Amino acid sequence: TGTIQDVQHVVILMQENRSFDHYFGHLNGVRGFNDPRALKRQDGKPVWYQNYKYEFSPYHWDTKVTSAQWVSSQNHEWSAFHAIWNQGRNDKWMAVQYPEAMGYFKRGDIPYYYALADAFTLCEAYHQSMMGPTNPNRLYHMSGRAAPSGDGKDVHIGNDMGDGTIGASGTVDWTTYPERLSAAGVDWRVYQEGGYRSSSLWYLYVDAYWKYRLQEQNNYDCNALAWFRNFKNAPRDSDLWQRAMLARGVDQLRKDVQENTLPQVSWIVAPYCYCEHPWWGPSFGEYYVTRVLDALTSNPEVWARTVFILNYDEGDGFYDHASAPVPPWKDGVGLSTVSTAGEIEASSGLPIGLGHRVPLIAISPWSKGGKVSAEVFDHTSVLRFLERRFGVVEENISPWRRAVCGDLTSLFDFQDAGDTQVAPDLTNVPQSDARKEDAYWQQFYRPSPKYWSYEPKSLPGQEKGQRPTLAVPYQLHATLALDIAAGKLRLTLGNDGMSLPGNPQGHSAAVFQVQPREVGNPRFYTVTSYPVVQESGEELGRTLNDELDDLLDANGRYAFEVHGPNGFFREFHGNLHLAAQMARPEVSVTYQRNGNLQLNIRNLGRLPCSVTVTPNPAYTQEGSRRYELEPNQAISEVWLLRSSQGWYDLSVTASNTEANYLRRLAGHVETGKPSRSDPLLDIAAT
Ligand SMILES: [Ca+2]
Numbered sequence: 001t002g003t004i005q006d007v008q009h010v011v012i013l014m015q016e017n018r019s020f021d022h023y024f025g026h027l028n029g030v031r032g033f034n035d036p037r038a039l040k041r042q043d044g045k046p047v048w049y050q051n052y053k054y055e056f057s058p059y060h061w062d063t064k065v066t067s068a069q070w071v072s073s074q075n076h077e078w079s080a081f082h083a084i085w086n087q088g089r090n091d092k093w094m095a096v097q098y099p100e101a102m103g104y105f106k107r108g109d110i111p112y113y114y115a116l117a118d119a120f121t122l123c124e125a126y127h128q129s130m131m132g133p134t135n136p137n138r139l140y141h142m143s144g145r146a147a148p149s150g151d152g153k154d155v156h157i158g159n160d161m162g163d164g165t166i167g168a169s170g171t172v173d174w175t176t177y178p179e180r181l182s183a184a185g186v187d188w189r190v191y192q193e194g195g196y197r198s199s200s201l202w203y204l205y206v207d208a209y210w211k212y213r214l215q216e217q218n219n220y221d222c223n224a225l226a227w228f229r230n231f232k233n234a235p236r237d238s239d240l241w242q243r244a245m246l247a248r249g250v251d252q253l254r255k256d257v258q259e260n261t262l263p264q265v266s267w268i269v270a271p272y273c274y275c276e277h278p279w280w281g282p283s284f285g286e287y288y289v290t291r292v293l294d295a296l297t298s299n300p301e302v303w304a305r306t307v308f309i310l311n312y313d314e315g316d317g318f319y320d321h322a323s324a325p326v327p328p329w330k331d332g333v334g335l336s337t338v339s340t341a342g343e344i345e346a347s348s349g350l351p352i353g354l355g356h357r358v359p360l361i362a363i364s365p366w367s368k369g370g371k372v373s374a375e376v377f378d379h380t381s382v383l384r385f386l387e388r389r390f391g392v393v394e395e396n397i398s399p400w401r402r403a404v405c406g407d408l409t410s411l412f413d414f415q416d417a418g419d420t421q422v423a424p425d426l427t428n429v430p431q432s433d434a435r436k437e438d439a440y441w442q443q444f445y446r447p448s449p450k451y452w453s454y455e456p457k458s459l460p461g462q463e464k465g466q467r468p469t470l471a472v473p474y475q476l477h478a479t480l481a482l483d484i485a486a487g488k489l490r491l492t493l494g495n496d497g498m499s500l501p502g503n504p505q506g507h508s509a510a511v512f513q514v515q516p517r518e519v520g521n522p523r524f525y526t527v528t529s530y531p532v533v534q535e536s537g538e539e540l541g542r543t544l545n546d547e548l549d550d551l552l553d554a555n556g557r558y559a560f561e562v563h564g565p566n567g568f569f570r571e572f573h574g575n576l577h578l579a580a581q582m583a584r585p586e587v588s589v590t591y592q593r594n595g596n597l598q599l600n601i602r603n604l605g606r607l608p609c610s611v612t613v614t615p616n617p618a619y620t621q622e623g624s625r626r627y628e629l630e631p632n633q634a635i636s637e638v639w640l641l642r643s644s645q646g647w648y649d650l651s652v653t654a655s656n657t658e659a660n661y662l663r664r665l666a667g668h669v670e671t672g673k674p675s676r677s678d679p680l681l682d683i684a685a686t
Contacts, residue, residue: 003414004389004502007364008305012382013268013292014141015276015285016134016222017073019315020124020357023282025058025104026460027117029372029467029677030124031322033058033104033460034685036649036678037569037666039323040517040561041091046686047321048459050102052094058319059456061103067446068109069281069439074101074317078157081131082350087333088513088522090323099451101317104460105282112286112435115426121367121411121470125565127324128314128355129378129401133159135168135224137313141379142224143176144396146352150342155352157345161227165199168221173229177383177394178244181265184392189263192219193271194247196226204272213273213440216249220272250288254295257302265386268292278316283439290432293363297427304419307412308363309382320356323563325376325511326524327351327400332550336400336526337540338509343400354378354404365419366412372677373470374566376511378405385409403509403528409502410470459686466645466677473498473508473529474565475591475670480572482584487576489548489558496542497529498670513563520551520560552576557660567678569649571664579658583607583631587652587663595646595671597639603629609656613637616651618680619644641669645676 025033039047050056061068080096094102107114129140136156139146147155162168181188192198199218208215225231225244234240256262273280274288289310297303327340329351344351360377380401385408387393425431477494497508512525523546531541552558556576563569574584583605590598601611608631614624620643627635641648652663668678 002416004409006305006414007307007389009262009264009266009302009307010386010389011266011268011292011296011306011308013270013289013308013310014138015270015310015312017278017314017316017318018276018282018312018358019318019320020126020359021058021320022104022315022318023110023113023359024117024122024124026106026463027114028463028465029681030122031567031678032462032681034462034681034683035321036680036685037563037567038321038685039090039515041089047091048685050091050094056094056099056102056451057456058102058104058460059451059454060460061105061109061449063109063443065446066449067443068103068105068449069283069443071100071278071449073278074098076133076314076317078132080317081355085131088323088326088515088524093319097317100449102319102451103449104319107463110282110286112290112426112432113282115423116289116361116363118370119368119423119426121362121369121371121373123360123362123373123377123411124357125374125376126311126358126360127353127376127378128358129353129380131353131355132157132314134313135159135161135227137379138222138224139172141313141382142178143174144380144383144394145174145342145398147342148172148174150396150398152342152344153346155345161224163196163221163223163226163232165197165221166201166205170227171229171232172227175396176225176228176230177386178225179230180392180394181390182240182243184390186390186392187264188243188266190223190225190244190267190269191248191250191253192223192269193217193249194219195245198247199272215273216271218271219269220275220277222269222275250291250295253292254298257295257298260299260301262302262306276312281439281443283436287432287436290426290429293422294427294429297422300419304365304417306364310361310363311379311382312358315356315358322357323513324354324356325404325513325526326354327526328524332523333521334514334523334525335544335546337528337532337544338400338403338526339532339535340400342398362411364412365417366414368418368420370467371470371674372467373411373472375406375410375472375474376404376565377408381405381408400526404511404526410472410500412502415501461684462681464682466679468674469677470674471498471500471672472566472670473500473503473506474510474568476510476512476564476568476667477589478512478562478570479586479588481586482576482579484580487556489551489576491546491548493525493527493544493546494542495527495529498672500672510565514548515561515563516551517559517561518557519553523548559660566668566670567666569664569666571662573663574661575658581606583609583657585609585611585629585652585654585657587665589665591669592638595669596641597648597669598636599639599650600634600636601627601629601652602634603631605631607631607656609654611652611654614651614653616649618683619647619649645679646671647678647680649680
């Protein structure tokens with residue numbers, strides 16, 4: 001016992017069109033509306049201000065007075081999503097969307113979801129695989145690739161795949177993971193209220209004037225297994241059609257749980273009235289989650305070996321501030337040690353994914369405590385988790401997606417059981433029934449939310465408090481060097497990977513985003529903790545060297561930021577041409593074993609200079625330290641960080657040096673053990 005194999009039943013529930021900051025932008029301990037490493041626009045304001053001939057900012061939807069649970073969905077086409085992305089700038093959020101997409105909810109509107117988040121594990125770095133519509137994301141979730149072949153050509157980007165119910169009438173013909181599950185011999189099933197032709201336009205997309213209330217019989221064509229040739233043309237009495245595509249119910253799920261005959265792996269699909277789609281409120285999705293939870297938790301033996309994973313397909317047009325890792329798509333935009341075959345759209349040329357943030361909640365006896373996990377995951381991580389548990393490896397996973405995204409084994413603590421019960425409120429259906437009842441009956445008639453009448457006087461804050469967080473394998477180095485001969489900027493990016501209890505040795509892949517504050521274009525890098533054998537016989541990995549030639553101005557001015565995973569910040573400023581003929585310092589880092597930090601300052605110049613280190617006042621109260629460093633000199637300093645929860649933000653300045661010269665270092669020391677969240681989140685952003 002005590003391993004991943006102890007898990008026996010796995011349930012996957014997948015809702016629609018809810019971004020991260022829309023739900024948990026206020027929750028304490030998450031990288032929410034007050035991320036201190038927020039992206040900065042060209043004008044110098046943080047990205048929380050968006051310019052569309054006027055200044056737009058996020059605002060709090062207050063269901064107690066308006067109808068925020070009934071808002072029409074926005075436009076989230078592929079072109080719209082990529083124009084939002086803007087090749088890493090992420091600043092045209094209001095260019096294509098509409099103002100109402102900037103709203104966010106609070107605990108007063110969704111008590112059930114916030115109770116779940118406070119009680120169960122939440123991922124704040126979960127990204128959608130394709131920056132596009134629903135079906136391709138669900139195609140990735142059910143197959144692991146949205147193309148007939150893994151060469152990057154003919155990848156579906158619009159929407160054709162379907163079952164001829166709500167306008168989607170296509171058929172795709174590559175190997176699907178449930179087929180591998182059937183071939184292997186693992187019991188799998190799909191829970192939905194109806195099969196073929198259950199959903200109807202006449203029922204759901206005509207405002208449903210006859211009912212407009214509830215439909216517990218259809219499935220909204222969200223079954224991605226039904227779009228494949230083998231399934232769509234399987235024998236009517238065949239095993240595949242029995243296991244996958246039929247009519248079932250959540251009451252039958254409760255019956256199966258109480259009979260100790262739960263299918264090993266269950267895809268739970270939702271009816272349209274409950275699947276969180278913007279035509280319907282989050283309260284209905286809460287009620288369905290309550291039904292699933294009370295059905296599942298109705299037995300000790302079943303709950304002692306069950307893992308329930310709730311996630312969403314895409315974030316729709318709802319606002320999210322982070323910028324997702326992406327693979328290089330042309331020249332002059334960075335290099336990756338791992339071959340990006342099949343990850344780049346051939347016709348368009350821009351990369352497919354990954355995309356913005358969507359919530360992921362893990363409910364299991366091994367996933368309590370209200371923890372927050374900073375590793376980056378995509379839809380393929382679920383299939384990789386099934387691979388890790390059952391051993392059936394899906395080859396359809398693109399190599400870049402295999403390297404970048406994790407396998408969800410870092411969320412759960414399998415060294416124990418923790419088989420305790422769950423709070424009575426979340427399993428108590430009738431109060432959630434009351435919430436659904438007065439949500440439909442009251443918030444229906446309230447006026448709709450605007451932005452021209454509910455403009456915010458300030459950017460939204462965050463709930464007070466920290467949360468314990470889970471260890472991540474990312475430890476990074478980013479050093480800058482100036483070529484005194486060629487006058488170029490050389491960036492050394494490095495990774496090692498942290499050993500984990502869930503990761504036997506510590507394979508990991510990190511993505512770096514380099515943001516030009518003044519001039520240039522964002523440049524992305526992918527490094528890995530293991531060697532990668534390139535097609536030419538080389539051995540890439542563990543270290544990358546790049547040259548930032550195009551960032552320089554006409555007079556040598558350079559000013560840029562280096563981002564990453566888990567709040568890795570390195571801000572570099574200065575100038576080059578005049579810097580040649582006097583001294584210059586350089587800053588290097590070393591992660592001590594016991595969670596402390598070591599800072600080394602290296603001088604190769606010609607005259608002595610004084611260098612002062614002044615930490616941010618929030619983390620610690622000891623004073624700045626200054627050293628008079630000579631030419632060809634170096635000194636090392638040990639910085640204690642246990643009282644700051646193992647986070648650092650240092651500003652290194654110097655005298656007798658160039659103007660505008662300033663170095664900024666910031667991040668979290670990774671040691672392989674769970675720790676707390678960032679203390680700086682609850683400090684007001686502006
Ligand atoms: Ca969707």
